[PDB]
Design a protein around this ligand. Sequence first.
Ligand SMILES: COc1ccc(S(=O)(=O)N(CC(C)C)C[C@@H](O)[C@H](Cc2ccccc2)NC(=O)c2ccc3c(c2)[C@H](NC(=O)OC(C)(C)C)CC[C@@H]3O)cc1
Ligand SMILES: [Cl-]
Ligand SMILES: [Cl-]
Ligand code: NA
Lengths: 99, 99
Amino acid sequence: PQITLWKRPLVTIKIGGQLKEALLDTGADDTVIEEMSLPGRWKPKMIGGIGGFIKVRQYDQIIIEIAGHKAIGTVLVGPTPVNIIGRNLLTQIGATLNF
Amino acid sequence: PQITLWKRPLVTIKIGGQLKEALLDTGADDTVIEEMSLPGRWKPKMIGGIGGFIKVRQYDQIIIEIAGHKAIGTVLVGPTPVNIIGRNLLTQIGATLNF
Ligand SMILES: COc1ccc(S(=O)(=O)N(CC(C)C)C[C@@H](O)[C@H](Cc2ccccc2)NC(=O)c2ccc3c(c2)[C@H](NC(=O)OC(C)(C)C)CC[C@@H]3O)cc1
Ligand SMILES: [Cl-]
Ligand SMILES: [Cl-]
Ligand code: NA
């Protein structure tokens, strides 16, 4: 689809058996999800932005369904104020910015 | 143009006669630039990012070119880690997300 930017570009995702709303975010390198359980190994990471840094858990090789499109990649889990789909998964669904 | 997301979507902007680099960021409602001089009065705004909230200076009706496209609108100035072009200006340049 073509999503305009008049409002926040929010979509439904499926991750870990759960449905969530998330922001399609070209400014985010990585995908960052609010606290939830995911299977497998993880390692700690710090990520930063406006307001400073937060600590997250990095899970690799996680499958997500984004607006009906399946992708796999790393997911960061921690105290983000909104679920963010970053470039590492936007590429896999073929998302582009067009103007 | 059609911009893929394998790398950060960095473009050149021109503001105040000066060229700067900025990130096209669909996850930002507003445009936020690092400390610089802009004309006119400003008003206060608080914005929340991944690590918390920061105070910025809001300047309205500022002339700005984004990847060659002319825009006139609101620019927030403050301690952002990167210059960010948010949805207020992405809509003026006709940008959409496509997949
Ligand atoms: C390593 O992977 C990363 C690293 C950093 C980030 S980031 O979240 O810090 N960020 C990087 C940028 C700053 C280079 C992505 C960015 O899209 C972020 C992504 C983001 C968006 C929202 C909050 C946190 C992070 N948005 C904002 O920081 C942002 C900017 C301006 C404003 C907001 C957010 C504010 N958004 C807001 O409060 O959103 C709600 C109400 C939905 C929570 C509105 C006011 C202002 O217009 C994400 C993944
Ligand atoms: Cl990845
Ligand atoms: Cl591609
Ligand atoms: Na894993």
